[PDB]
């Protein structure tokens, strides 16, 4: 089923590309502060995720999403718009992005197991490893289970909702 694996690879390639643009925007604003090293490590992590999905796109001849120029601008603007609020706004954006990416990885792991674990074994291992890395962030002090302000929890949810819309559009377009 090439149509099912192409949709998975295209939307994962688009998600890691948009995450690259968000950390580029955050580094453009908070790059020389005390959270600069933390953002740099986050940005370097997604450069490896995007590099791997580029190889899978070439190997399986997957059509990239037509909305990449849109994610290029919106990702940078969202990353730069936050971190102009401050470090708490930047970290709220980071957690909302990592959780939104890990959320969609879980859905793909579920549907990939229900079809053919033997055939989709190499891809499942990669997605599980990436899904684990989207949640660890303990050596940098970024805990996904932290009591945010009631207003920052709404901001995180709005960002997370927007990423879900982008994920929906990218796997089709």
């Amino acid at each position: 089923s090439r149509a099912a694996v192409d949709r998975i690879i295209r939307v994962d390639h688009a998600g890691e590309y948009g995450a690259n643009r968000i950390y580029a925007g955050q580094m453009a604003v908070l790059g020389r502060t005390s959270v600069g090293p933390v953002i740099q490590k986050m940005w370097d992590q997604e450069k490896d995720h995007l590099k791997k999905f580029n190889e899978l796109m070439v190997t399986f001849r997957v059509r990239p999403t037509v909305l990449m120029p849109l994610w290029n601008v919106l990702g940078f603007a969202l990353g730069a718009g936050t971190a102009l609020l401050g470090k708490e706004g930047a970290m709220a954006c980071t957690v909302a992005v990592e959780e939104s990416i890990a959320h969609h990885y879980n859905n793909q792991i579920r549907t990939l197991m229900e079809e053919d674990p033997e055939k989709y074994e190499e891809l499942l291992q990669l997605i599980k490893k990436f899904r684990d890395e989207e949640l660890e962030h303990h050596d940098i002090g970024l805990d996904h289970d932290a009591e945010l302000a009631p207003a920052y929890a709404v901001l995180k949810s709005i960002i997370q909702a927007g990423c879900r819309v982008a994920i929906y559009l990218s796997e089709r377009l």
């Binding site: 996904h144 289970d145 009591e147 929890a153 709404v154 997370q160 909702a161």
Partner: protein, 181 residues
């Protein structure tokens, strides 16, 4: 199994929600009685799904009793008032912490999940009332009952009358004003 592990964990956590709430503290404490996110979104959605499943079993049992003669058929206005009251009485043990749970369900990323659960619930209520609509009245009837349920649920949160008698009186007028529309 694999997915049944968290399902049992989530099921056991509901015994401590009245004391602690819909947080991840009760998720762990519920598991500590069995042995093994932080906002509680997955715990709340599990509870709503289970309550919807309990409601559709109650409506099946009442349907059997009326088709065999052990019960008499009620009118649509009377049936819908009883179905909404039956579903809302499942929130009585958790009445103090439910406004917090509603806040989580109203978060922008939880709205698609909450709407689908609410749509399935009012679809079940209208089916056992004998709807059989294939035109746009399918959407009109279900939207009307969804609005009645949500506004009655808000009245129930801030109600201190004995046995929520002011909530069911509000539900009655709400259903009567809709059957005349």
């Amino acid at each position: 199994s694999e997915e049944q592990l968290q399902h049992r964990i989530l099921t056991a956590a509901l015994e401590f929600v009245p004391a602690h709430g819909w947080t991840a503290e009760a998720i762990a404490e519920g598991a500590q009685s069995l042995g093994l996110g932080k906002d509680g979104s997955e715990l709340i959605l599990h509870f709503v799904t289970q309550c919807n499943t309990r409601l559709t079993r109650v409506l099946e049992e009442e349907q059997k009793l009326v088709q065999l003669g052990q019960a008499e058929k009620r009118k649509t206005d009377q049936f819908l008032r009883d179905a909404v009251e039956t579903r809302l009485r499942m929130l009585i043990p958790y009445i103090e912490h439910w406004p917090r749970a509603l806040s989580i369900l109203m978060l922008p990323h939880n709205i698609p999940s909450s709407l689908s659960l609410l749509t399935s619930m009012v679809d079940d209520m209208w089916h056992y009332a004998g709807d059989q609509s294939t035109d746009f009245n399918w959407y009109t009837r279900r939207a009307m009952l969804a609005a009645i349920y949500n506004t009655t649920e808000l009245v129930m949160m801030q109600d201190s009358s004995p046995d929520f008698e002011d909530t069911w009186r509000f539900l009655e007028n709400r259903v009567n004003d809709a059957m005349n529309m």
